[PDB]
Amino acid sequence: IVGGTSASAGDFPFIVSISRNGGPWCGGSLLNANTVLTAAHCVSGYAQSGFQIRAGSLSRTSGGITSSLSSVRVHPSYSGNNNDLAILKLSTSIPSGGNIGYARLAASGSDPVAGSSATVAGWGATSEGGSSTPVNLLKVTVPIVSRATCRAQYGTSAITNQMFCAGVSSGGKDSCQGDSGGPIVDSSNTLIGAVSWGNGCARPNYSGVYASVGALRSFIDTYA
């Protein structure tokens, strides 16, 4: 997270940190006791054994409840940067209560409205190319970018309706490497997306790009 602030206890009760090979890697959203929503590019093709989930902590290293993975279901038509979602099943159930809770998903058919305020959280880099990764969770608030504008930035082909964009035209607030898979929420704390991709981080004129929960509810509701 670039241009962000420290998250408070309880801000995102459903957020999970995903480590790989004991090192930081991605974030995710707890859908229910045995199910995590992340980015496909977090898990696709990699040894499943490498992954650990941690819930109910501001720290990616300590506290809360941990689980290994029993299974990985990548979106059947995950393709390049598109349909960048995966459902993870947990060997250890993660019950709700305390600072643990489950994500409220964006309505099927919904698409975040340009100009509306979104909040993204994670444990990734605090600048593009940065080598520090926070131990404690950060968050940042950014406006939704019109798909038309995002198409201008990236090309029409690059941006589908299974993606949306968020960021600030003068740059300096974004998700970054190590944030992928983690939650982007609306002003009501509804899960609208997962951190997916971008040209660098927080660049003026290159929005952060998110996998759209509203577009991909079929996939999610099936396997959740």
Å resolution of this model? 1.8
Active site residue 41: yes
Contact 37, 12 (CB under 8 A): no
Q: Pick the catalytic residue: 17, 19, 57, 180?
A: 180
- DSSP, collapsed to helix, strand or coil, labels residue 217 as helix
Using alpha carbons only, give the angle 179, 184, 190 rounded to the nearest 5 degrees.
Answer: 150
17, 19, 29, 41: which is the annotated catalytic residue? 41
**Could you give the CA distance from residue 220 to residue 211 in angstroms, rounded to a whole number?**
12
Annotated catalytic residue within 17, 57, 67, 84: 84
Instruction: Write phi, then psi, for 40 (nearest 5 degrees).
Output: -60, -40
Report how this structure was experimentally obtained: X-ray
Active site residue 212: no
- Do residues 69 and 42 make contact, with C-beta atoms less than 8 angstroms apart? no
Dihedral angle sign, alpha carbons of residues 163, 19, 189, 167: negative
First to last CA, the chain: 27
How far is Cα 78 from Cα 170, in angstroms, rounded to an integer?
31
**Position 9, amino acid:** A
Helix ranges restricted to H, 123-173: 147-154
Q: By the 8 A CB rule, do 55 and 35 touch?
A: no
Which domains can be identified in the chain, with CATH numbers?
A: 1-12+103-214 (2.40.10.10), 13-102+215-224 (2.40.10.10)
Amino acid at 197: W
Of 32, 75, 74, 82, the residue nearest 55 (C-alpha): 32
